[PDB]
Amino acid sequence: GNYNYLYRLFRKSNLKPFERDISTEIYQAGSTPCNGVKGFNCYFPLQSYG
């Protein structure tokens, strides 16, 4: 399993041309706030390929 390559599955907006996103901040998937800690409806934006 080569999981070293990751992609930005979740983001709050589409990217402008020639824009790079390198901020490893938590994503809020629901109305419940996450406050920077993982939990229910708090999924990490970056996921690894299997």
Partner: protein, 50 residues
């Protein structure tokens, strides 16, 4: 119902407010495989089978 005799409930001729269901935290698994949960309240479909 049972798994071998699952009841198929058809949802049509109504407006579905997926926000209330999506914001309920009692569902321990809310996984989608063909669409986007954040786009459910805008897209349109012919009918829904449960």
């Amino acid at each position: 119902a049972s798994v071998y005799a699952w009841n198929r409930k058809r949802i049509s001729n109504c407006v579905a407010d997926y926000s209330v269901l999506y914001n309920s935290a009692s569902f321990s698994t809310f996984k989608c495989y063909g669409v986007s949960p954040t786009k459910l309240n805008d897209l349109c479909f012919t009918n829904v089978y449960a």
